[PDB]
Amino acid sequence: MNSEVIKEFLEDIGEDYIELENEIHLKPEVFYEVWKYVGEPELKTYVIEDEIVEPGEYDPPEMKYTNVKKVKIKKVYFETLDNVRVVTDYSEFQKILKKRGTKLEHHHHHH
Numbered sequence: 001m002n003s004e005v006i007k008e009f010l011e012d013i014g015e016d017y018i019e020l021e022n023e024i025h026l027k028p029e030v031f032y033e034v035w036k037y038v039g040e041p042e043l044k045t046y047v048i049e050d051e052i053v054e055p056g057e058y059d060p061p062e063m064k065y066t067n068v069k070k071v072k073i074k075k076v077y078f079e080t081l082d083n084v085r086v087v088t089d090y091s092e093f094q095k096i097l098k099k100r101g102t103k104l105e106h107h108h109h110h111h
Contacts, residue, residue, distance in 0.1 A: 002080065003084040003086075004082075006086070009037070022083060024086045025088065026086055026087075028088050031093065032093065032096055038078075040108075042108070044076070044079065045074055045090055047073070047074050049073075052069050073090075
């Protein structure tokens with residue numbers, strides 16, 4: 001299927017997609033269903049260390065120095081025939097996996 005098919009599928013079910021040009025960011029629960037809908041292939045996960053910066057908290061006296069925090073978050077996506085990457089929170093994804101008790105085999109019955 002093409003990514004255009006996925007958009008039409010989302011249209012029918014009634015869900016919004018966040019497309020950032022070749023990146024379709026979806027909701028974890030939707031992703032889980034679409035994943036198996038397309039035959040559940042291998043997922044590609046990436047790590048992005050995104051640091052949260054300090055706004056300007058005026059509470060501690062100007063002598064101590066506030067620090068930014070490096071959030072290394074793991075996210076998951078799969079690429080379609082159109083090279084469109086459907087990205088989803090891997091943190092939330094595994095959270096749903098653990099919730100439903102979906103055990104990921106070391107060798108999937110689709111390869």
